[PDB]
Coordinates of C-alpha atoms in Angstrom, one line a residue:
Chain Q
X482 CA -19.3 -55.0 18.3
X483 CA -17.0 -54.4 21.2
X484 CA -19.6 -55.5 23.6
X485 CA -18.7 -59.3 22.3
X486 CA -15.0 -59.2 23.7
X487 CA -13.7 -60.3 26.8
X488 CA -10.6 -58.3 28.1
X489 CA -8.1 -60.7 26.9
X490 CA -9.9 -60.7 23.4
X491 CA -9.2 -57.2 23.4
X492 CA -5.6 -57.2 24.7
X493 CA -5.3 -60.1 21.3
X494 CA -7.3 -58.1 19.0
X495 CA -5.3 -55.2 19.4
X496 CA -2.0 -57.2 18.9
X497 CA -3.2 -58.4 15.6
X498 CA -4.8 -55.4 14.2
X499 CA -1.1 -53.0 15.4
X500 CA 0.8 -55.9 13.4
X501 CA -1.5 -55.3 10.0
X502 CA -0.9 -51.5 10.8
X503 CA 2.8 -52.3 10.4
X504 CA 2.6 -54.8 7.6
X505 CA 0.9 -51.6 6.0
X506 CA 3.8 -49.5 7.6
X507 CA 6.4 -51.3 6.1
X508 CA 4.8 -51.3 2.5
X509 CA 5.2 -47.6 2.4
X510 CA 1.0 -48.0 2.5
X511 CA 0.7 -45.1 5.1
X512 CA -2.9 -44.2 5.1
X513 CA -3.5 -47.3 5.7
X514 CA -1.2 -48.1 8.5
X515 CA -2.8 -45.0 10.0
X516 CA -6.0 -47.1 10.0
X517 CA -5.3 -49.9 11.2
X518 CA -2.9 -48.7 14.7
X519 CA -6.2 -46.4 15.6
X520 CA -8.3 -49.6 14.9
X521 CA -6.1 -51.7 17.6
X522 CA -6.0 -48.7 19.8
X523 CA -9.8 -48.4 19.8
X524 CA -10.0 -51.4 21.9
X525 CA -8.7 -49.7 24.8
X526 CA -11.3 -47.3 25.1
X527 CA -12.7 -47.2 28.7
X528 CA -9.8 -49.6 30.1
X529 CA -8.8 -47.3 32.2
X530 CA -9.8 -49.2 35.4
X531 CA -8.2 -52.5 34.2
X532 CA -6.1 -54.2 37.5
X533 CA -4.5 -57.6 35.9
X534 CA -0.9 -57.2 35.6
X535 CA -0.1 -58.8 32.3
X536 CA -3.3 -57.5 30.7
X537 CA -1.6 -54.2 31.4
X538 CA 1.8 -55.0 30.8
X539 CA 0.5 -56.5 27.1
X540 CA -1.7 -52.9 27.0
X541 CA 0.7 -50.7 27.5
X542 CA 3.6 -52.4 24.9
X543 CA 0.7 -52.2 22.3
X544 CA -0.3 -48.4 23.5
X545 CA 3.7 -47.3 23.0
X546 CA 4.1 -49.3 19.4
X547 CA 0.8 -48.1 18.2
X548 CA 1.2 -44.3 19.2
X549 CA 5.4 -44.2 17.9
X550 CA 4.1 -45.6 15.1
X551 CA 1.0 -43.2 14.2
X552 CA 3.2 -40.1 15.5
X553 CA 6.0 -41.5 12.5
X554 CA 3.1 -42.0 9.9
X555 CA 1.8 -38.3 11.1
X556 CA 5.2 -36.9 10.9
X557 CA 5.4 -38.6 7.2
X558 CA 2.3 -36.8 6.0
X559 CA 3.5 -33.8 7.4
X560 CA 0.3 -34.1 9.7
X561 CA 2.7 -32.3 12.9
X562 CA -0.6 -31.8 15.3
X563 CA -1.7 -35.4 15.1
X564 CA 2.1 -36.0 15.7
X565 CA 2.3 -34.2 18.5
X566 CA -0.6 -35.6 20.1
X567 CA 0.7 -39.4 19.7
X568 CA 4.5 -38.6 20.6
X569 CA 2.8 -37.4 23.6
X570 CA 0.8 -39.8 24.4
X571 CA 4.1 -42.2 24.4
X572 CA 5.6 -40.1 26.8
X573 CA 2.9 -39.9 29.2
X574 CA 2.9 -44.0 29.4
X575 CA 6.7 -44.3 29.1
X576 CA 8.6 -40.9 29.9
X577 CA 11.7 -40.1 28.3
X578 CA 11.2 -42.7 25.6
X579 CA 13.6 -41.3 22.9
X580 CA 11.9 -42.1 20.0
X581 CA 8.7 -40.4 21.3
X582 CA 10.9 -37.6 22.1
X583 CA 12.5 -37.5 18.7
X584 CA 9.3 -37.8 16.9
X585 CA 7.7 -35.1 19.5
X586 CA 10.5 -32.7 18.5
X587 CA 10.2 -32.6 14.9
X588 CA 6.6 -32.0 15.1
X589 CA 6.9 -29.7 17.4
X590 CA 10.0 -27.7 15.4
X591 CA 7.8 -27.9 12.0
X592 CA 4.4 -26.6 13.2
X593 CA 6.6 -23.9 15.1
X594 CA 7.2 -24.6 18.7
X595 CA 10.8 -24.0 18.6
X596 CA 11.5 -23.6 22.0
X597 CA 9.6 -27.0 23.1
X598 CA 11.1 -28.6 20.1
X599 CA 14.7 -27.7 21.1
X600 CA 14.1 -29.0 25.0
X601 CA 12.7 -32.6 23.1
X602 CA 15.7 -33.2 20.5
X603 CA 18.0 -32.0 23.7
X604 CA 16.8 -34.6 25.4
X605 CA 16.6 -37.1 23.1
X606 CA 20.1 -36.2 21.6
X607 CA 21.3 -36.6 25.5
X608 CA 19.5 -40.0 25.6
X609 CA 21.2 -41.4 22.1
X610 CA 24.0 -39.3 21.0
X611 CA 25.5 -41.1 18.8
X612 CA 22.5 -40.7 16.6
X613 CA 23.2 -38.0 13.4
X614 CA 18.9 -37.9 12.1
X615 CA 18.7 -36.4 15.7
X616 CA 21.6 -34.2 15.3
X617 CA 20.2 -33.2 11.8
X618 CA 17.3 -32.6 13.3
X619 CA 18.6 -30.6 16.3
X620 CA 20.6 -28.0 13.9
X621 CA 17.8 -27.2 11.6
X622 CA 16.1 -26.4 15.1
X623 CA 18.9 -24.4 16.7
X624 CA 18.9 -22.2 13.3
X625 CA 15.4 -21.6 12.8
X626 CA 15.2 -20.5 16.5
X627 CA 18.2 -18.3 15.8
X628 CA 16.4 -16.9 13.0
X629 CA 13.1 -16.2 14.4
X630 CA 14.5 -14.3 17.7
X631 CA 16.7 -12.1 15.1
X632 CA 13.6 -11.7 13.8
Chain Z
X544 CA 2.5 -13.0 7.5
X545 CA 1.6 -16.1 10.4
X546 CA 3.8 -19.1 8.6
X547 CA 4.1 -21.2 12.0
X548 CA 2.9 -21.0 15.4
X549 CA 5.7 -19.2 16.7
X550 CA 4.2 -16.3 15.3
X551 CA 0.8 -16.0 17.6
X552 CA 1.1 -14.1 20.7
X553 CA -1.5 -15.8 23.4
X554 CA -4.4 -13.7 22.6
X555 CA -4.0 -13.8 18.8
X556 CA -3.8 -17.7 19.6
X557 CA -7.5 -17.3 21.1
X558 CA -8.8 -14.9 18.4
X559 CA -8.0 -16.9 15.5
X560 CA -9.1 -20.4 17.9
X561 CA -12.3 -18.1 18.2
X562 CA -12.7 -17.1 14.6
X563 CA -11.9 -20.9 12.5
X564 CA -14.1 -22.2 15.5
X565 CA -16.9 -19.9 13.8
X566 CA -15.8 -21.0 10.2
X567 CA -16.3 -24.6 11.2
X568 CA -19.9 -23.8 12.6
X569 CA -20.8 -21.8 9.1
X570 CA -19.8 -25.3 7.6
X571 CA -21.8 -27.2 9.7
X572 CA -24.9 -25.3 9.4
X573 CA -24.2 -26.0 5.4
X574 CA -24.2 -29.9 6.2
X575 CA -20.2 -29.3 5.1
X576 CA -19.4 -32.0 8.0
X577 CA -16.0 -33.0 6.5
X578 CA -15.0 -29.6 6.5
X579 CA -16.8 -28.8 9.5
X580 CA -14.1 -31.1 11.1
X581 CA -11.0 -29.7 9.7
X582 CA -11.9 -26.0 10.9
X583 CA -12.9 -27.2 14.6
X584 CA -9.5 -29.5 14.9
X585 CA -7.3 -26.4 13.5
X586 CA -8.9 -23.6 15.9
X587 CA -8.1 -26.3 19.0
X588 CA -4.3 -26.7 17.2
X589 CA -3.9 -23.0 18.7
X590 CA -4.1 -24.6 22.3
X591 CA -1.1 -27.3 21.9
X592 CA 1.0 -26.4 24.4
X593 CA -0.9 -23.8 26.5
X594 CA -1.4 -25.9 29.7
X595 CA 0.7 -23.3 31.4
X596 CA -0.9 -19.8 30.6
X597 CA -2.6 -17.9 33.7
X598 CA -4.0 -14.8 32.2
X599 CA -7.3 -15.7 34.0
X600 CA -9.0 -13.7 30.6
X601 CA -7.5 -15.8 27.8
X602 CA -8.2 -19.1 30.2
X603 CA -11.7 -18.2 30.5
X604 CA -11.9 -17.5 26.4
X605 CA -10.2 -21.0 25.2
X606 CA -12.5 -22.9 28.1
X607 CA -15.1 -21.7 25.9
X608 CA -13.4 -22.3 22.7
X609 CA -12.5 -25.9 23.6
X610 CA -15.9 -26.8 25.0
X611 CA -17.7 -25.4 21.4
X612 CA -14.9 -27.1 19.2
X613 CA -14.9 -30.2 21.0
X614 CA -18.8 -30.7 21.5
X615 CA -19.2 -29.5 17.8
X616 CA -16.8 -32.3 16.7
X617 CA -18.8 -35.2 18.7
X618 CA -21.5 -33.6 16.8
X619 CA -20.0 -34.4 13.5
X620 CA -18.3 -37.8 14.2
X621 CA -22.4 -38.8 15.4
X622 CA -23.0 -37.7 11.8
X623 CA -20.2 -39.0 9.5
X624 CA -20.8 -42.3 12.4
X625 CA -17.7 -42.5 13.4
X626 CA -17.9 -43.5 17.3
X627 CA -14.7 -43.6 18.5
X628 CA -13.6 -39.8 17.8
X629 CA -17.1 -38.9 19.1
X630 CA -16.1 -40.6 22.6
X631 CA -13.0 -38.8 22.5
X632 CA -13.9 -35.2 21.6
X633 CA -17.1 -36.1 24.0
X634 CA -14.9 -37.1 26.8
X635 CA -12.3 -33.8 26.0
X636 CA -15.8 -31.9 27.4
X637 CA -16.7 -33.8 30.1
X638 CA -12.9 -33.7 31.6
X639 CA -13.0 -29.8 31.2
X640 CA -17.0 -29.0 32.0
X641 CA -18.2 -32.0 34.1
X642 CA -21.6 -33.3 33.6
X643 CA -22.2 -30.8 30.6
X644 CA -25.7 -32.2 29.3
X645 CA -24.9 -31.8 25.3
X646 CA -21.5 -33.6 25.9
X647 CA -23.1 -36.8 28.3
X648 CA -25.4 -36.7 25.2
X649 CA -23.1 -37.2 22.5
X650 CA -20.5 -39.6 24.6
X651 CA -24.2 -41.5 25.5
X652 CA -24.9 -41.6 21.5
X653 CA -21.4 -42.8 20.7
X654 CA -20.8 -45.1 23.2
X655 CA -23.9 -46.8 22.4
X656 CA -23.3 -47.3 18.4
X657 CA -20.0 -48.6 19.3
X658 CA -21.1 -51.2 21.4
X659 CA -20.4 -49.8 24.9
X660 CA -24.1 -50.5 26.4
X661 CA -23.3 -50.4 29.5
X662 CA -21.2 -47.0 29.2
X663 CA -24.1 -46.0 27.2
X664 CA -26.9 -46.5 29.8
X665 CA -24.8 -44.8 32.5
X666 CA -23.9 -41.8 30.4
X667 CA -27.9 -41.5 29.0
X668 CA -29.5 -41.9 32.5
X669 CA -27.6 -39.2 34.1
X670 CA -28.2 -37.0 31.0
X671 CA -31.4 -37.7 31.2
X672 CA -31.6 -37.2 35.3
X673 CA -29.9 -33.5 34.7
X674 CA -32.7 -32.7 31.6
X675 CA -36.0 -35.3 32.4
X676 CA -37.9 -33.5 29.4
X677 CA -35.5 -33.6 26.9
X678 CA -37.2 -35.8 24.1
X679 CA -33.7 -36.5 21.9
X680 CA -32.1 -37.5 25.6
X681 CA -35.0 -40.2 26.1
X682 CA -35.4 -41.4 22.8
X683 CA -32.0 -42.6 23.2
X684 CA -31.8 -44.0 26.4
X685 CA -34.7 -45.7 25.6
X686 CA -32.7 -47.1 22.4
X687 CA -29.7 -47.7 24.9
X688 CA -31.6 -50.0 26.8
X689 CA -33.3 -51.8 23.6
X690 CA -30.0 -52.5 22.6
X691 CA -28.7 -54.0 26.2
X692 CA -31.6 -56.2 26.5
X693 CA -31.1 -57.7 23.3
X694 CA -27.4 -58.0 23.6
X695 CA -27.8 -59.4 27.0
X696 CA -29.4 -62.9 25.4

């Protein structure tokens, strides 16, 4: 059980298991993936008082890939609450990361926070705008807003 | 017809939150713990977002609402033994109603299947400290510490 791991086994265990998440990933294998980056993420529960600098340098790299990752996955199964709660959890370790802000703002836009999803894909648009799956992104936003307030 | 969030005003968010929330429970009741799950996760989907409301009312309601919905779900992640979303819907209580008994309980319970003993012991003693008679608090801390001695050699 966890009780058998050191910190360091942890911060390595949770390295491996995120890269069979994306090996998963990559296969199209979703489900799976999903599995496997909440697995690795699992050994960070109650770390919240770790002090060593690379053991949280090495925690947090692993936090932001395994959270983007699950908020994509979440996203692809049109899962947008479980989405939202990972894109967020990017941005509360690494603010204005623009993939977390992108990934944030579709969910956000498809379950129907319009307003919050505009203010993400503005700012990740602002952050990388020579991107067009933003753009895309940003006018289906822009035009369901404009449909709901005429409605 | 509601075909998004953007269709809720605040207190329809809390009625419908309060309503699914009783859905799940008529679920659990029916051992339905699968589907118990889904209800209690959707009626807390009505709060994404709401960290900024101030109608003193509506906060008071989804308190309430999140406290059932989360305790309910460490409830049914003990069940289908799956630790980790225990500790987190556990902790979600504990971070909103501080040393609730039910919610030490459950985080106690979870903590120790996982394999945090230690976390465990903590959690199970101070449950037990706030409710000394409780015989499902004792059983487990006495498990708890059953565990920790044997994992300790």
């Amino acid at each position: 059980s966890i009780y058998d791991y050191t910190d360091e086994e942890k911060v390595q265990s949770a390295f491996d298991i995120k890269e069979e998440g994306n090996e998963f990933f990559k296969k199209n294998e979703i489900n799976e993936a999903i599995v496997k980056y909440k697995e690795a993420l699992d050994f960070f529960i109650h770390t919240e008082e770790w002090d060593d600098q690379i053991l949280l340098d090495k925690k947090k790299n692993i936090e932001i890939s395994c959270n983007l990752n699950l908020a994509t996955c979440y996203n692809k199964n049109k899962d947008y609450p479980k989405a939202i709660d990972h894109a967020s959890k990017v941005l509360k370790i690494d603010k204005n990361n623009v993939k977390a802000l992108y990934k944030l703002g579709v969910a956000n836009m498809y379950f129907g926070f319009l307003e919050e999803a505009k203010e993400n894909l503005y700012k990740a648009a602002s952050l990388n705008p020579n991107n067009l799956d933003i753009r895309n992104s940003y006018e289906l936003c822009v035009n369901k807003l404009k449909e709901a307030r005429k409605k």
